[PDB]
Design a protein around this ligand. Sequence first.
Ligand SMILES: O=C(Cn1c(-c2ccccn2)nc2ccccc21)Nc1ccc2ccccc2c1
Ligand SMILES: O=C(Cn1c(-c2ccccn2)nc2ccccc21)Nc1ccc2ccccc2c1
Ligand SMILES: O=C(Cn1c(-c2ccccn2)nc2ccccc21)Nc1ccc2ccccc2c1
Ligand SMILES: O=C(Cn1c(-c2ccccn2)nc2ccccc21)Nc1ccc2ccccc2c1
Ligand SMILES: O=c1[nH]cnc2c1ncn2[C@@H]1O[C@H](COP(=O)(O)O)[C@@H](O)[C@H]1O
Ligand SMILES: O=c1[nH]cnc2c1ncn2[C@@H]1O[C@H](COP(=O)(O)O)[C@@H](O)[C@H]1O
Ligand SMILES: O=c1[nH]cnc2c1ncn2[C@@H]1O[C@H](COP(=O)(O)O)[C@@H](O)[C@H]1O
Ligand SMILES: O=c1[nH]cnc2c1ncn2[C@@H]1O[C@H](COP(=O)(O)O)[C@@H](O)[C@H]1O
Ligand SMILES: [Cl-]
Ligand SMILES: [Cl-]
Ligand SMILES: [Cl-]
Lengths: 354, 353, 353, 354
Amino acid sequence: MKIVKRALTFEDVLLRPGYSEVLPKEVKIHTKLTKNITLNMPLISAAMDTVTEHRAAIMMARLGGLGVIHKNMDIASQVREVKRVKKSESEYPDANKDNFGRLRVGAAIGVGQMDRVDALVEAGVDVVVLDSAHGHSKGIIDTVKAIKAKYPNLDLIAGNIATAAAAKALCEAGVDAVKVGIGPGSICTTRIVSGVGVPQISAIDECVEEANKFGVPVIADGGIKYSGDIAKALAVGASSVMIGSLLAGTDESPGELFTYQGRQYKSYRGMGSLGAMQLVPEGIEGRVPYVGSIRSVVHQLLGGLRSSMGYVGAKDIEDFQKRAEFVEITTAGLKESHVHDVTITHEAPNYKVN
Amino acid sequence: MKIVKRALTFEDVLLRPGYSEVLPKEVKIHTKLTKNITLNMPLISAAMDTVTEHRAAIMMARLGGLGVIHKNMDIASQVREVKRVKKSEKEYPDANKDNFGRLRVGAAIGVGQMDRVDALVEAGVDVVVLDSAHGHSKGIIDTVKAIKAKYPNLDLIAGNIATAAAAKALCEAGVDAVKVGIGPGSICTTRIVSGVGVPQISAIDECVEEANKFGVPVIADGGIKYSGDIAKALAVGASSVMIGSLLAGTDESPGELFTYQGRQYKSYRGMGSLGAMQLVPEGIEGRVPYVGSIRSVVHQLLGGLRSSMGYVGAKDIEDFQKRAEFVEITTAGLKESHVHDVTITHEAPNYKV
Amino acid sequence: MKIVKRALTFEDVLLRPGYSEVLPKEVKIHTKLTKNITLNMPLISAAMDTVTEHRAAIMMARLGGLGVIHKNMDIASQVREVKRVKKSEKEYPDANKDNFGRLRVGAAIGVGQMDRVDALVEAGVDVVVLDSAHGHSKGIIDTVKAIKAKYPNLDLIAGNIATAAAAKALCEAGVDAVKVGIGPGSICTTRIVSGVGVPQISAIDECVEEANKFGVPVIADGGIKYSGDIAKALAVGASSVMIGSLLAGTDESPGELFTYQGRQYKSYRGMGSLGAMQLVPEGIEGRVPYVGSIRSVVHQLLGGLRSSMGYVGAKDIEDFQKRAEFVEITTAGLKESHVHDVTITHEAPNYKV
Amino acid sequence: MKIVKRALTFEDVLLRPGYSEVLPKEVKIHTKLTKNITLNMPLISAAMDTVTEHRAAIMMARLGGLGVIHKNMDIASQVREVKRVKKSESEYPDANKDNFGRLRVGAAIGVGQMDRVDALVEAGVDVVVLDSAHGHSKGIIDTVKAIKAKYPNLDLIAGNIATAAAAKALCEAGVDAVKVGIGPGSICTTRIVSGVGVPQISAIDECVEEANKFGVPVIADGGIKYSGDIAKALAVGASSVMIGSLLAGTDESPGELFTYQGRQYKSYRGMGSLGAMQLVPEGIEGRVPYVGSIRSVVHQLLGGLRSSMGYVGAKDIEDFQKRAEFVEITTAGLKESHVHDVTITHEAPNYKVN
Ligand SMILES: O=C(Cn1c(-c2ccccn2)nc2ccccc21)Nc1ccc2ccccc2c1
Ligand SMILES: O=C(Cn1c(-c2ccccn2)nc2ccccc21)Nc1ccc2ccccc2c1
Ligand SMILES: O=C(Cn1c(-c2ccccn2)nc2ccccc21)Nc1ccc2ccccc2c1
Ligand SMILES: O=C(Cn1c(-c2ccccn2)nc2ccccc21)Nc1ccc2ccccc2c1
Ligand SMILES: O=c1[nH]cnc2c1ncn2[C@@H]1O[C@H](COP(=O)(O)O)[C@@H](O)[C@H]1O
Ligand SMILES: O=c1[nH]cnc2c1ncn2[C@@H]1O[C@H](COP(=O)(O)O)[C@@H](O)[C@H]1O
Ligand SMILES: O=c1[nH]cnc2c1ncn2[C@@H]1O[C@H](COP(=O)(O)O)[C@@H](O)[C@H]1O
Ligand SMILES: O=c1[nH]cnc2c1ncn2[C@@H]1O[C@H](COP(=O)(O)O)[C@@H](O)[C@H]1O
Ligand SMILES: [Cl-]
Ligand SMILES: [Cl-]
Ligand SMILES: [Cl-]
């Protein structure tokens, strides 16, 4: 058998602190979404039917990031969701807006869905997210070429991928960003069901190095549990991070609150779960704790990133990537990194152990 | 001390995705059981008294695979089981059949059991599976030589082994397939009791490299918990996979269904457990959740396999093995690979925790 | 990406035994706090509002160590705490005292707090501990320069750091000790929240190699759970150890004792927790078991240290560091090192699970 | 810091099966206890007050191994325990006997206990086990030299040690066997309390290589949980294994049976536990499950060893050591080695997971 390497993920590594003349409050967190679109902060909500519809994409863009409307609905519904975001108005000085001063929004499509693309363009979507379980596939590559041919000024994101060869193929196909992540999603069983995938830190590292040669941003999609993971993903070279599970428990995410055994929850499920698809399932249907507003979640997450960048001595994301040095740690190191030998009595807003 | 390598198993590795032009529904999954016997799908039910009798064996063959009738019964009883399969009769277009249109079946034998082989050969058995806890032994090798001498056109599988040296010995003795696995079985305590074994992925890899020289296919036997493990075993170069615990919960497996504290189960035990031997055991007696029909289980398992081959861009298994690249992962990598940070509310058909 | 090393912590290593001619009762455990301040035993209580006020500080000093009064209070209050220690009065023959026979005490300060330093220096403080979550910063380094300029004979400790580069910066700025530890603290979430830190053993090792060039002692701060960790920290070359969770359960720590579900506790929280800050926290609020007096805790901890030095054959700490050889262990090695395969019925004074 | 090596213990390694012309029933398991004393099988019960008094040492020797009477009693009591074993009579054809046809027995002593040694010699003890928490110490080395000087034909065992230099010092001191094990005992907190110790497989490996140059057997003392560990310890080069926890729950071991929450137990405690010593404790006081007779325990343990040797192709222990090849495994390998993905319904006599 051919073993190419030993691959690491988030928990395997930590950033080394460096000399710093910058306070966390002073750092700038703007970043590229694609080659032609800027975010005022690096978070994107996942294209999932238990995460991102209009209320969520509105908040995400008001806070300077992006929401991506899921494709588990007919064209007319998705169009209507996009218009709701575009026509939204308010306090949000970091808002992420197009040239008309309208909140930016993204919308998911799948292979061959060219009629959906047409409608979304005419609805004034800012970015189309072309998604497959296997981005490195002929269907995806062909779809990219068709979309760039018909809409040369439409910003196009394609994924998911996990290797440098995939990033090369997509970039040469004409994408404006690649999405990295095969298997690391909280609700994902892809690696278990089919044995395929690449640990997320290594996948991002590999793809970034290739995507850089084309001036193409990488989106790190899936597997983020804590703000520290966001920092690590960015430091390794990603330009933004896509998040589902950390947002699925918010007010704005689709679905109703429910209480079960004294706790509040919302539903969260893979788009490859049996429920969502109504191919063998590559995702599960579950529940996540209720966590209040998107605003409160994003605030804790960005505060973590700001801390990290303060520790590293970085003024902006690009400086963060140039300075960042990692150390690989052991299981015992991870155990020391978490809270240990104390029982938590009041839960912190940015650290929950289940 | 002499340490020859760091040895890996299923949970230590993942397959890298590759450029694909094939959809999962389009890939071909036929394979080889032995030099001369073909499978339409690569699964074999284990030769265990809680897994394979005639009902399981019939379903496995109708679906394109194979069942091996266990040997924890007298010769006559086993002859009868084999006969029920061979006499069995669009609905099963992938049925694995012999030149007469009869379902194929295998039967297990032990060292020096030529009387059992005689009666099985007479009963129309398609393949004989020579089983020992230690396939790399004088007893096993002599039995091989004697069987091939007396029945030269009888397909012979022997095991279990875990080293290239063992593979070489068996191939030179004249086997038509080798079975790999010392200690990975769900119900197995061999490694703990005797301190002996080789993590299943490295074992398959080592033995495939040796047996390939002789044109001898390798059966990966034991340690499969998920469809993804089937894919890995095949990608590393196994030609087929033998499965126990995943099928012991099925309607067709021997034994009755029972309910305990709100959950349904069937029994499952090692053939070296106390119960099965009736003494220093190398297996345990336990229970597995009821999972309904073998059909539904096989469907999900082949689903994952096809999906894997789609991800690798492999049109068939030879191509899969050719293209397959692995990456070694850490404990944190395994944790990320499983479902994490979400509570499952509706369990999936092909993923249980 | 740039990975500079595989970094280890306490549970990754063990000390090898060596030829010994010393019994544990015979070894000497005096050490250095700073270039100019001496300790009779090497423990310092953490500068936390659930660990060190005047009661703890007095006990730590009477036993030959030191307490650092925390800074989560106004300047006046902290001046008063420091004053209660300095005014405090065979029973304590190892008492750590200044040239006037007064117990020694330290006090914590933050970046740009020269007013606090002024009032502490006036109150007779023996050492000032300059604390920041990130000691390798322009703020900390400028504060050092300003303090040493204004009070050149005032012993100054600064931290926290975890790299040789940080150690070098601080030593050149003029500190009398560096404090090492980014993220190992029991109540600390820094590593999870910001992704930043260095496993404590490698951190100490890196910083000791740098600071030693300047004659500057290293304080290992955070992550101690057992006496054995104290030994390792010292053997790697720390001159002293700062301890939080192990002392938060004591009579003398601030806060009241309470009972919850049959067990006794006191509160313990990070100075960067929400509660202590009153916002994006880097600590948590929790509880630790009540453990009785500081004396009894320190007794057990120094017991393990002396035992360690006996095992290594070290007559004193310099000798310990000289002789110490480590071995790196695996997860299975750690499991064997703990109590295993037996249920504890009467808990030990110095081992809790 | 100086890191000499990465050290492995039992769970880190497995034996490779080899070509075999031998059945488990056919293999011979006799071994050297010391340079001048043979065991018919390689097990020794631990010198502990909750393991080995006369009833236990009698059974151990009848089965061909050895019991070592603990030293937590006055001289007269220990002498009387030794005589009880020596005067025992019975069915036990593998019995381990001196030249007078009396069951062999060993007795523990500590540094300087020369009067106890005299009494034990006069009681007809076969081997004296000189024990310290730190065998590589001047007190121990001096005691060895004094005992060999006064009783040149008395077989003398000394420990505990964990390094090649220790084995060299003891061998040159004149011992007839060295005992290896600092920290691996089930009830031991030495490694936690003082940070000192060496993972047991590495310790045995290191000491055996040194002890061999003197023709001195190594005893592997502590950390055995399963029969597989016995095989591994022997394959690495040890001549016998000392066991406490696996025997503490037997009829013959000191102490009464008790029932707590529907289970039967016996007490088991470190000799460095607070209870036993009545220095900071380096052991705990606990309980272990009741397991019936020593005969039934030893039978399962020896059957495991016989299997192992059958797998390796070994006719006797020395052949076992020459043939044995190990492979290092991962955490996932260990997980696969144990029972997994099945719930046990009838507990096996040689495999219990708690
Ligand atoms: O689409 C899924 C599973 N799946 C998912 C999903 C979503 C995110 C991550 C993983 N899987 N969503 C689905 C929706 C419908 C049907 C199948 C679905 N799996 C695969 C597997 C291999 C492929 C090879 C070439 C082309 C496409 C391939 C697709
Ligand atoms: O047969 C078993 C135990 N055992 C099993 C069994 C089945 C599958 C995997 C492991 N063990 N089934 C048994 C049925 C009856 C008696 C013993 C049995 N163990 C061994 C062990 C070493 C050997 C060395 C040379 C030749 C044969 C050897 C056999
Ligand atoms: O001070 C805290 C958090 N924090 C803490 C604390 C204490 C010990 C360990 C970690 N954090 N205590 C605080 C008290 C008030 C407000 C914030 C606090 N975090 C940071 C993070 C990055 C920095 C970079 C340059 C300079 C200062 C930086 C500070
Ligand atoms: O004797 C014990 C602890 N201890 C034990 C024990 C028994 C087995 C394993 C570990 N410790 N039994 C004891 C009985 C009484 C007092 C202390 C005891 N610990 C030490 C530690 C370092 C030493 C250095 C030189 C000489 C002797 C040393 C002893
Ligand atoms: O069902 C699925 N199977 C596998 N991955 C999925 C599925 N549905 C969504 N995803 C991915 O998982 C991500 C969410 O990851 P999370 O932030 O870790 O919960 C999404 O952005 C998708 O990339
Ligand atoms: O009692 C036993 N001890 C060791 N291996 C066994 C025993 N019984 C069956 N096996 C092996 O384990 C396999 C079943 O593995 P499973 O698929 O992991 O449950 C069988 O096909 C045999 O190779
Ligand atoms: O809230 C916090 N976040 C991170 N580190 C902290 C915090 N509060 C105290 N510390 C550090 O952690 C140490 C206590 O570590 P402990 O001995 O493991 O409990 C203190 O001495 C500080 O160095
Ligand atoms: O209290 C103690 N502390 C550390 N080791 C001990 C103590 N008492 C006995 N031992 C050792 O532990 C062994 C028992 O190991 P076990 O077979 O793993 O339970 C004994 O043979 C001694 O070598
Ligand atoms: Cl730096
Ligand atoms: Cl061989
Ligand atoms: Cl691990």
